Amino acid sequence: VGCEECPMHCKGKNAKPTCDDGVCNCNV
């Protein structure tokens, strides 16, 4: 995953993606 490829991976409704040291992660 990546910062420019996060939205594609994690996609829901109340799940916002985040970038931490090149580590993408979606929470809220």
From Swiss-Prot:
Disulphide connectivity of cysteines = 3-19, 6-24, 10-26
Ranges in a coiled coil: none
| Keyword Signal attached | yes
Q: Keywords on this record?
A: Calcium-activated potassium channel impairing toxin, Disulfide bond, Ion channel impairing toxin, Neurotoxin, Potassium channel impairing toxin, Secreted, Signal, Toxin
| Keyword Disulfide bond part of the UniProt annotation | yes
Q: Name one GO molecular function term.
A: toxin activity
Query: Where does the sequence pass through the membrane?
Result: none
Q: In which tissues is it expressed?
A: Expressed by the venom gland.
GO CC annotations on file: extracellular region
Q: Where in the cell is it found?
A: Secreted
Q: Which family does it belong to?
A: Belongs to the short scorpion toxin superfamily. Potassium channel inhibitor family. Alpha-KTx 09 subfamily.
Task performed by this protein: Blocks small conductance calcium-activated potassium channels (KCNN, SK). Weakly inhibits the Kv7.1/KCNQ1 channel (10 uM of the toxin inhibits currents by 23.3%). Low toxicity by intracerebroventricular injection into mice.
The domain-related comment in the record is: Has the structural arrangement of an alpha-helix connected to a beta-sheet by disulfide bonds (CSalpha/beta).
Entry protein name:
Potassium channel toxin alpha-KTx 9.1
From the broadest rank down, the organism's phylogenetic lineage runs:
Eukaryota, Metazoa, Ecdysozoa, Arthropoda, Chelicerata
Task: Please specify the portion of the entire protein covered by the chain, as first and last position out of its full length.
Answer: 29 to 56 of 56
